[PDB]
Structure formats: C-alpha cells, structure tokens
Amino acid sequence: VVKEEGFARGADVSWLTQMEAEGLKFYTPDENRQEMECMDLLRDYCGVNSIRLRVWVNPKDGWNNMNDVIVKAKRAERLGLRTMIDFHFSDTWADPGHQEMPEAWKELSFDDLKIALSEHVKSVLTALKAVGVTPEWVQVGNETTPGMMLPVGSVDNPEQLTALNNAGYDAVKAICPDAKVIVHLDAGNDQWVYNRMFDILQANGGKYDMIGMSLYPYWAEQEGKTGGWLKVADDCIANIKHVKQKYNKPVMICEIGMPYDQAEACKQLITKMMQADVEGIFYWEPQAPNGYNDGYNLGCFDNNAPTIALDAFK
C-alpha cells in the first residue's frame, strides 16, 4: 500500500483506541457484513486516504496523549494513510467555549509557557518521526475562534496569541520542515470570525500555511433557520473563496459532520463541498455510534457500519 497524493479524504478517528478497549466492533456495509478493524474499513469501503488525530497534554485517562497518538499514527502509516496531528494545547477538549491550558502550565511565565508549548509539539513530532510517521499537516490549536489557552492566548491579547501561535509553528517546522501548519476555527460559514483571527495574525507576524474550518450545518435545519443547512454550506463556500483571496492561503475542512440519521443529506453535503476550493475534508469521528460519549449523534455509522454518507469519497 502507498499513500495517496492530492485531495485529502479524511477521518478523525481519535476515539478508536478507547472504543476498541470498550469492545466496539465495526462491520462492512455490504451483504457479507464482515467484522473489520475500523481504519481498514474506512480505507477500503469509505474511500478514506487520510487520518486526523487530536493531542492532549496530560489527560487523566491517557487517551489522546502522545503515547496513544503514536499508536494510531503508526497504524495509519502502515495502512498507507496520510496523517494530520491536531494539538489542542489542553488536557481535555479544546473548542470555542473551552480553551484551557494544561494544568501543569498554569503558573509558568509567558516565556516558559511558550517553551512548554514548543517542547510539547516537538516531543510529539519527534516520537512520530522515530516510529516512521511524518505528518502531512499539523494543527496549532483546535477551533481557536476566541484564541487558545485563555485568558493568556485570547484574541484580546493579540501579541501573546500570535507569540503562542508562532512558538507552535516554529516547533512543527523544526521536526517536520514540510508539514503544513493549520490554524483551525469553527463555523466555516462565518466570515467575521475568520477576519478577526487572521487580521490579528497579519498585524503581529503570525505564521501559518493553511486555514482550517469546521462545517457542521445541520443545526440550521433543526432550528428552522431560513435557508436550512444548504445556506450554511453555501456561506462556508463563500467564506472559503473570501479567505483565499484575502489571505492567499489554502483551506482544509478539518472537521465535517451531519446527524448519523441524515445519510442522504450528508452524502449530498460532502459531494457539494468536494467541489469547493479546499485541499481536503475530514469527517469527524465517523465510526462513533449514536449516543457515544456525551450523546454524540454526528457520526455516519449505523448498526456498527458506514451509512451511504461517505459514498461521496469512493
């Protein structure tokens, strides 16, 4: 098997090692319904050529730590899958409402905080290099719409945010000179969020190679917003065009998802977005059963097998 080039048809499968430990099984969606390892299933039946993995610094239960990430990245590599590493710079989930630095970093000087961030990035990438894995892409933060490691890396501290961003960028290039560094925000439909962040980076010499977006549009259907999920997708396509023009950087859809029970609409969304001016699309945790963790319903499996959603990728 060899890694594909070109458009990234991806999945984030960070939960996979925990699910395996908990005893979940995955099956082929054809008549034979063969039990199968999940990455191999995604590659062979869902057209996936790329895998994304989150990194948490000192997580209580160990999942998403460097050690776990190495396991999944080695498996991706062996199966001929390209890898994206997504640094949360937290001990737990990083998202627009929750950007908490690791507890161990909370009393460092700003100068030592930059060094700890840098050392975390380098140590993870160095360990990946040692086991034969060179990521194609790396995110410096995850959905950093308000900044990262708040309050210190808040957009309200543009100099400090930029300095943390650049420590990350520098650390990636140190170990992986050809890795594309992604700044990833949520709400790809929302130009204003992108303007604010990327104008901060412009104003302060922020380094990044690629703009990352999340697209989860089904809420607009459910809340009965005029235009439905299609309007949110069209607004995302407009925003993709806008950031390319204004900042001259390529765009990745780092996360996409629809309700597991919206197979047909999800297939159409992905088919639609595959013609947008992006370098790839990563389905977030496609294998997660409805209800997983806190009640997650935006997987694209049912009865432990892929729905037609990722038929877009085949």
Determine how many CB atoms are found less than 10 A away from the CB of residue 262: 20
Q: What are the DSSP calls for 228-286, one per residue? A: HHHHHHHHHHHHHHHHHHHH---EEEEEE---TT-HHHHHHHHHHHTTSS-SEEEEEST
Q: Closest Cα partner for 188 from 100, 96, 124, 114? A: 96
Residue 266 or residue 288: which is nearer to ligand GAL going by CB? 288
Whether residue 91 contacts residue 59, with contact meaning beta carbons closer than 8 Å, is answered with yes
Asked if residue 22 binds ligand GAL (CB under 6 A), the reply is no
Rounded least distance, CB 255 to ligand GAL, Å: 8
Asked if residue 100 binds ligand GAL (CB under 6 A), the reply is no
Residues 252-311 close enough to bind ligand GAL by CB under 6 A: 293-294, 296
Q: Report the alpha-carbon distance of residue 286 to residue 230 in Å, rounded.
A: 21
Rounded least distance, CB 93 to ligand GAL, Å: 4
Whether residue 214 contacts residue 188, with contact meaning beta carbons closer than 8 Å, is answered with yes
DSSP 136: S
Residue 221 or residue 285: which is nearer to ligand GAL going by CB? 285
Residues 179-238 close enough to bind ligand GAL by CB under 6 A: none
Which residues is 83 bridged to in the sheet? 51
- Interface mask toward ligand GAL for 60-99; x: CB under 6 A: ---------------------------------x-x----
Rounded least distance, CB 95 to ligand GAL, Å: 4
Q: Closest Cα partner for 50 from 21, 12, 16, 23? A: 12
The one catalytic residue among 77, 143, 221, 285:
143
Rounded least distance, CB 186 to ligand GAL, Å: 9
The one catalytic residue among 255, 264, 279, 285:
255
Q: What are the DSSP calls for 179-192, one per residue? A: PEEEEEES-TT-HH
Residue 97 or residue 132: which is nearer to ligand GAL going by CB? 97
Residue 125 or residue 187: which is nearer to ligand GAL going by CB? 187
Rounded least distance, CB 141 to ligand GAL, Å: 13
Q: Closest Cα partner for 250 from 280, 217, 214? A: 280
Q: Report the alpha-carbon distance of residue 250 to residue 25 in Å, rounded.
A: 37
Q: Report the alpha-carbon distance of residue 45 to residue 212 in Å, rounded.
A: 26
Residue 26 or residue 292: which is nearer to ligand GAL going by CB? 292
Rounded least distance, CB 110 to ligand GAL, Å: 26
Residue 43 or residue 52: which is nearer to ligand GAL going by CB? 52
Backbone angles phi, psi at 61, to 5 degrees: -90, 5
Number of residues engaging ligand GAL in binding (CB under 6 A): 5
The binding site consists of 95, 293-294
The binding site for beta-D-galactose consists of 95, 293-294
77 is catalytic: no
Q: Which residues are catalytic?
A: 143, 255
Residues that bind ligand GAL (CB under 6 A): 93, 95, 293-294, 296
